[PDB]
Design a binder for this molecule. Structure first.
Ligand SMILES: [Mg+2]
Ligand SMILES: [Mg+2]
Ligand SMILES: [Mg+2]
Ligand SMILES: [Mg+2]
Ligand SMILES: [Mg+2]
Ligand SMILES: [Mg+2]
Ligand SMILES: [Mg+2]
Ligand SMILES: [Mg+2]
Ligand SMILES: [Mg+2]
Ligand SMILES: [Mg+2]
Ligand SMILES: [Mg+2]
Ligand SMILES: [Mg+2]
Ligand SMILES: [Mg+2]
Ligand SMILES: [Mg+2]
Ligand SMILES: [Mg+2]
Ligand SMILES: [Mg+2]
Ligand SMILES: [Mg+2]
Ligand SMILES: [Mg+2]
Ligand SMILES: [Mg+2]
Ligand SMILES: [Mg+2]
Ligand SMILES: [Mg+2]
Ligand SMILES: [Mg+2]
Ligand SMILES: [Mg+2]
Ligand SMILES: [Mg+2]
Ligand SMILES: [Mg+2]
Lengths: 146, 172, 257
RNA sequence: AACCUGGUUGAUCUUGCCAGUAGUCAUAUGCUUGUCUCAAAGAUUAAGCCAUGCAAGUGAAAGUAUAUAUAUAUAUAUGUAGAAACUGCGAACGGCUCAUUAAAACAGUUAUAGUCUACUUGACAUUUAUAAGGAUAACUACGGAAAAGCUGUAGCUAAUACUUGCAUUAUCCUUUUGGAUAAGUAUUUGUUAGAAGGAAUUAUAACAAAGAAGUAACACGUAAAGUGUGUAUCAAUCGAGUUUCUGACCUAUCAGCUUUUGAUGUUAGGGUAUUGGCCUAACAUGGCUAUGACGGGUAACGGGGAAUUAGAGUUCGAUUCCGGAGAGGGAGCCUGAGAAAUAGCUACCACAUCUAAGGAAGGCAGCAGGCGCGUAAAUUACCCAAUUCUAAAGAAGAGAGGUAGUGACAAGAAAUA
RNA sequence: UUCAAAGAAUCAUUCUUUUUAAAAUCCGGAUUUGUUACUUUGAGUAAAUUAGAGUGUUCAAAGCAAACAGUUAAAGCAUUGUGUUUGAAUACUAUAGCAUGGAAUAACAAAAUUGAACAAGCU
RNA sequence: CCGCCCGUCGCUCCUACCGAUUGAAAGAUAUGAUGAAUUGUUUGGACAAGAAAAAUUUUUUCUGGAAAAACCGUAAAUCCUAUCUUUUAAAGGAAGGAGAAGUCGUAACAAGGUUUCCGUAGGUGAACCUGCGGAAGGAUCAU
C-alpha cells in the first residue's frame, strides 16, 4: 500500500501526463540506490526521490533507533580533548536524521548523513549512504571513533 | 510566534530571554471561503505585499492531460486531508478537492475536436467523462489562496481521482 | 529598535586601512557600493591617509565638492565611497591617474599610471547569470554587470574592461599557468603563475601559486584575481612586483640602504 | 629569580596545617604628597528613585513660497534670499547598563539549493499631451480649554504629497528596402523543455491561465551633450533572520525526565520573507538520560581578553572591540527597508508630577546633576575644531565625540642638591 | 602482516640517491593501492591587547610615526616644472571544522559447518 | 606521678540544631477563575463622494468609511489555591565551643593498680561497668 495518508501521496517533480518516476543524484559521490530509481514510495524529504538538496556538513554516525516513521537516530561518538589532563574523553551526540525507505536500516548500522534544510523540530539531516555493520551489545554503548 | 517558547527535545524548559522580534511574525489565518471575491492586502516584510483572499470563487483551473487552463466559478468543497471542519465551513486551501463548474473545459474540447498545442491522442478518462456529463468536476486547489489570493487549481486525474472518490465513499 | 549599523569603530576598522587608535574614536564606514567593506577602502582614506592631499575629512569633502575626482571615469562626491581592488582614480586637477593595487603587505597603495593604460581596468567575473531573452550577463568583483559578455568567459576569469565605454576588450581564462594576483589571506600582494587547482567537491577550491622566486603558496580560488598569461601581466604592478620576501630577506634589504 | 623562612618538642626527624612573603587594568580605606606625562572613575549595594537643563535633526544649483524681503534689465521681465508649513530622508545608528539568560546566548565552522534587504553601485522595462483630476497645510477670520508638543469651525493654495493617464522589438519571403505573425516585470498555478553548480523542481525557453507594481504630467542648468529626484526586475553591497558542527562554571543531600497544555516523528495544511510543531487537523509512540537527562545554584551576560604562572595551570573578564539582551514591570501594537522601538504609541501593574479637581503628561540602564543605598565612585563645565554619523549632505545639527574641571584608580619619568 | 639492501658527500656519525615483490593504468618503458585517530604543511580568520620588527615621544610609559638634503640650492627626475626614501612587518586567532605529505604508534574494517579470482560455456 | 589528665554536675558567654505555632515573610513557577489593551475577521453604517426624481427638497441603488458591537488569537493584570525556594520568630529541649584555681569522682597514660582497644547488647550520677566475638595498636615474636 503506497497511498496511506488522508491525502494522495503524489511525488512532486514527477510529470505524469506529458514527457519522454522522479529521482535525482544528490552529489558528493553518493550513489542513488536501486530502491529509489526503481520501487515506488513517495517521500517529500528523501534526498534522492524528494525535493531536499543535501548541502553543508556530511557526518557518519551509527543508528540507535528505527522507531520513528522514516526517521532514524544516530549517535556520533567522538573524543573531546581536555588540555589540562592532555587526555581525551569519549563524548557523544544524537543526531536525528530523516531516512527515506530506500534504506532498510536496522540498529547499529553505520550511516552517513548530509545536512539539508530543517525538516522538523530537530531533524536537519538525511541519510545518504548506509553501510551495513553488525552490533552485539546495544548501539547505545558501541563507541566507533569515526 | 514563529519562535522558541517550546521544550528543548530533552523536554527541558527553555527559560526565555528575548521578547518577540517582529521578524518572528505569526499573523493569523485567513480562513478563505466561497462567495463573491474579496481580498485584503497584508504588508509582509520588505513591503512584500501578499493577498489574503478571504472569499473566492473564480479560480484558474487547469486540465493537466491537455495542459490547459480556464477560469471557473467553484461550486463546492468536498474533501480536506487536513480536517473535515474546513470542508464543513467551505474553506479553500492548497490541497482542497473542490467541484468546478466544468462547462468551460467541455466547450474548449468541442471547439478543438469533437464533443466530449494539440498532442491529442490521450482522449479522456471514463470517470472524468461521466463527471463532465453532470457539468461539475472534482479538482484540487494548488495555490495557497491565503497567501497568493487566487484559488488556482487543477483537475484531478485517473489514479488520484479514483483515490479521492474512494475517500469520499457515502457507504454509511 | 535594531536594524543595520551606521558607525564603524576605529579599532574595529579593518587593519589595512591603517588607522590610529588615537587620532579618533570612529572610522569612516564605507558606503554600500561596488565593494565588500573588508576588502575595499573608502575615498576618505585615500585622500587623507594615502595621498595626504587632505589633512581632514572636511578637506576631503571640499575636494569632492569640486567634481574633480573620478573613480572608473565617472565622478563621485561621496566621501566614504568604497574604491576597492583594481579601480582607476582620476584626480583631474593634477592630471594624476592612480590605480589601486595591493602592496606585498595587505595595504592599498595608489600606484600612479599613464593616460593610455588608465582607459581600461581588469575585472574578475564572479557569476554569469542568464537573464530574459537568453542573454548572459557577467557580474564582476567591481559589483558591475557586464551584459552580452563573450560566451567563452567562465565563472572565475578576469576581463579587461574599458571605462570610456562599458564594453569589454579581451578576457583571460583561469588556466593552469595564468599570471595571478591574490586579494585576501597572508599571501595577499603575492603574484604568481599557478601550478595547480584542487577543485574540491563540496568545499572551497584551493589553488597553489608558484612565485618568481619559485616559492609555492596555496590560496582559496575565491580570492585570486587573474592578471595575465604566463608571460606578461596586463597591468602595471607596483615596484615590488608581488614578490613577498621572507622576513629575514626583507630586513637585509632594509639594512642595505 | 623554576626560591622559601617562624610555629607542635626537653631536644630530634616527619606529616601537617597556621603564619609570614610577593603580585593584582582589585576595590576600599589610613597617614602623607613639590614637578611633569598618561588617565580609570555610581559596575559591585538598589536593572532603586528622580527636581532642572540639555542628548535628532535636516534646505549653499536642484520637491512645495502672492508670510516676506530685496538687486538688477527695460509696470513688466528675470533673479537673489526667505520665517512658516507640507513633502522627503533620518530618528532602528549612536550612547547606556548587565537584570535576565548554563547547549541558551556567545566563539569559531558551515548553510541559506530555505529567505528578506532602504540608502549606495551597475545593469536596465512590459497589456487634453504645448500637459490632466481634486484636496490639504501653513495662512486669514471666528473659537474653545486651569493646563498639555490640545485642537474646533469656515475660507483658501501648492507640491517629486495624493490620483489618473498619452511606436518598437523577435519570429517567415523578396532585393539595406516592402508585407505576415505575435508582444505583461515580479508573483502564482498547471503543462513541459533544460549556461552553470558536488547536487536542481536552478538560470532560462515554450504552451494554457491569471497578475501586482511600474516604464518621468518632476527639479535644476549644467558637460566638453550634463545632473538631481523617482522608478519594474536583476545583480552587487550595508546587513538581517534562521541554521550545521564543536566548545561552559558549581550541585547526584537534583535520577529519572518530556507527552491532555506539541513532548518525538509522519501526512495535509495554515502561517512566515523562507525553513521548520512555528500553528492547526489527522495518525503513530516516540524523544532525552549515569558520556549526568530533568531540576537546583551562580554574589553568570558570552567572547576578544585580565591577573598571576618556569612549565603546566588557578582566578577574573560589569567595564575601550564583536555579539546578546533591556529601557520601572510584563504584554500589545502603528510607522517603516529595518522596531515588537520606548527621549514612538495602547493597556494593565508598581512608582510618581501638574491641576481652577473637570482632566493632563511621565519613564536618566543618554550627559551632567540630585536623594537613596551604601566600604565604594568626578562638573548641573566649554565646543563641534578633531574623529564620525544624519540631512534637502562643505556651510546644519550631534551630552555620539572631543577639551578642560575633580582625580595619589592605575601607569611612566623625576627635585629635595 | 615489507623486514631490509646498496652507492655518493661530511667530521664512528649526518643528509641525499637507487631497488626489493603483487595488481590496475599508460606508449619492453612509465605512473595508483584500506578508513579514522595521530602528525606535518597549508588555507581561512577583526583589530585592541599579547609576543614581536622598525622608529632617540629629551628618556621612559607611549604613539605609529618618521628619516634625509638646504640662511633656502644643489642633486635627482619631468617635458621653466617637480622634494625624495619610505614605515605602519611578522607571529599568535581553539580542544572543533576545511584541504594536505605521512612509512611509526593506535584503533576499526576487511577475512572458512565454508570465501572470491580468473578461463570456457549458456542465458 | 605532688605528672598528665577524663566525664557528669553547677555557673557565665557565643554558635548551630530540634520545636508546637495550618508560625511568619518575600520571591518563583504551575493550575484555574475573571480578563484591560489589541492584530485579524465578521456585523455595523455618525457621514463624504456618486447615481434617481421635483424646483434648494423628497425616495431608492453603488462606492469609501468613524464610533459601537460579536467571534477566534496574542494576552497584561488582579484574586484564589498548590508547590517550591529563601530569610525569619518561638516556650521548651538537646548539643557544641570558650571561659572561670567551682562540685563529684579516677576513666586513660606505667601490668595506670580489672592490659588496652574494637564491634554489638544491657546497665549505670559521672567518668564508665558488664556480657558475646574480635584485635595487639600487649605486658608474650620463644618449649
Ligand atoms: Mg529593544
Ligand atoms: Mg598565607
Ligand atoms: Mg614645570
Ligand atoms: Mg547601579
Ligand atoms: Mg560606567
Ligand atoms: Mg544642495
Ligand atoms: Mg523650515
Ligand atoms: Mg545600539
Ligand atoms: Mg508620489
Ligand atoms: Mg495536534
Ligand atoms: Mg546576573
Ligand atoms: Mg565582558
Ligand atoms: Mg551584577
Ligand atoms: Mg531605573
Ligand atoms: Mg517597548
Ligand atoms: Mg531618557
Ligand atoms: Mg512604561
Ligand atoms: Mg546620569
Ligand atoms: Mg574611590
Ligand atoms: Mg565635523
Ligand atoms: Mg593484673
Ligand atoms: Mg586510672
Ligand atoms: Mg586499667
Ligand atoms: Mg548490675
Ligand atoms: Mg553492671
Amino acid at each position: 500500500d503506497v497511498q496511506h495518508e488522508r491525502a494522495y501521496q503524489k511525488q512532486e517533480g514527477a510529470s505524469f501526463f506529458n514527457s519522454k518516476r522522479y529521482w535525482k543524484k544528490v552529489g558528493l559521490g553518493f550513489a542513488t540506490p536501486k530502491e529509489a530509481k526503481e520501487g515506488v514510495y513517495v517521500d517529500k524529504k528523501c534526498p534522492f526521490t524528494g525535493n531536499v538538496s543535501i548541502r553543508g556538513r556530511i557526518l557518519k554516525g551509527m543508528v540507535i533507533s528505527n522507531k520513528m516513521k522514516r526517521t532514524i537516530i544516530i549517535r556520533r561518538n567522538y573524543l573531546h580533548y581536555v588540555k589540562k589532563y592532555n587526555r581525551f574523553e569519549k563524548r557523544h551526540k544524537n543526531i536525528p536524521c530523516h531516512c527515506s525507505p530506500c534504506f532498510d536500516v536496522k540498529e547499529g548500522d553505520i550511516v552517513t548523513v548530509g545536512q539539508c534544510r530543517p525538516l522538523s523540530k530537530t531533524v536537519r539531516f538525511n541519510v545518504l549512504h548506509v553501510e551495513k555493520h553488525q552490533i552485539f551489545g546495544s548501539a547505545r554503548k558501541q563507541f566507533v571513533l569515526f | 510566534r514563529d519562535g522558541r517558547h517550546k521544550l528543548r527535545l530533552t523536554g527541558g524548559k527553555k527559560k526565555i530571554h528575548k521578547k518577540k522580534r517582529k521578524y518572528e511574525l505569526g499573523r493569523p489565518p485567513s480562513n478563505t471561503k466561497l462567495g463573491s471575491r474579496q481580498v485584503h492586502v497584508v504588508r509582509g516584510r520588505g513591503r512584500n505585499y501578499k493577498y489574503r483572499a478571504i472569499k473566492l470563487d473564480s479560480g484558474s483551473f487547469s486540465w493537466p492531460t491537455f495542459g490547459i487552463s480556464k477560469n471557473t466559478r467553484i461550486i463546492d468543497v468536498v474533501y480536506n486531508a487536513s480536517n473535515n471542519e474546513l470542508v464543513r465551513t467551505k474553506t479553500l486551501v492548497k490541497n482542497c478537492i473542490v467541484v468546478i463548474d466544468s462547462h468551460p473545459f467541455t466547450t474548449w474540447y468541442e471547439n478543438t475536436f469533437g464533443t466530449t498545442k494539440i498532442g491529442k491522442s490521450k482522449n479522456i478518462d471514463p470517470l472524468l467523462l461521466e463527471q463532465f456529463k453532470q457539468g461539475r468536476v472534482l479538482a484540487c486547489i494548488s495555490s495557497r489562496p491565503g497567501q497568493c489570493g487566487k484559488a488556482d487549481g487543477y483537475i484531478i486525474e485517473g489514479d488520484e481521482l479514483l483515490f479521492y472518490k474512494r475517500k469520499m465513499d457515502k457507504r454509511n | 529598535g535594531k536594524g543595520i549599523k551606521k558607525h564603524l569603530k576605529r579599532v574595529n576598522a579593518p587593519s589595512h586601512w591603517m588607522l590610529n587608535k588615537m587620532g579618533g574614536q570612529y572610522a569612516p564606514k564605507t558606503s554600500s557600493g561596488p565593494h565588500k567593506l573588508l576588502e575595499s577602502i573608502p575615498l576618505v582614506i585615500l585622500l587623507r591617509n594615502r595621498l595626504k592631499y587632505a589633512l581632514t575629512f572636511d578637506e576631503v569633502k571640499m575636494i569632492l565638492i569640486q567634481k574633480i575626482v573620478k573613480v572608473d571615469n565617472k565622478v563621485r562626491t561621496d566621501c566614504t565611497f568604497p574604491v576597492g581592488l583594481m579601480d582607476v582614480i582620476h584626480i583631474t586637477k593634477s592630471n594624476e591617474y592612480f590605480r589601486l593595487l595591493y602592496d606585498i603587505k595587505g595595504r592599498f597603495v595608489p600606484h600612479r599610471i599613464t593616460n593610455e593604460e588608465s582607459k581600461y581596468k581588469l575585472c574578475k567575473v564572479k557569476k554569469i547569470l542568464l537573464r530574459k531573452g537568453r542573454l548572459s550577463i557577467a557580474v564582476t568583483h567591481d559589483g558591475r554587470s557586464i551584459p552580452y559578455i563573450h560566451p567563452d568567459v567562465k565563472v572565475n576569469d578576469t576581463v579587461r574592461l574599458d571605462l570610456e565605454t562599458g564594453k569589454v576588450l579581451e578576457h583571460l581564462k583561469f588556466q593552469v599557468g595564468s599570471l595571478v594576483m591574490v586579494t585576501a589571506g597572508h599571501s595577499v600582494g603575492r603574484v604568481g603563475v599557478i601550478s595547480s587547482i584542487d577543485k574540491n567537491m563540496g568545499t572551497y577550491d584551493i589553488i597553489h601559486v608558484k612565485d618568481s622566486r619559485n616559492k609555492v603558496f596555496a590560496t582559496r580560488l575565491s580570492n585570486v584575481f587573474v592578471i595575465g598569461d604566463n608571460t606578461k601581466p596586463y597591468i602595471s604592478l607596483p615596484r615590488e612586483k608581488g614578490i613577498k620576501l621572507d622576513i629575514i630577506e626583507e630586513r637585509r634589504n632594509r639594512l642595505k640602504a
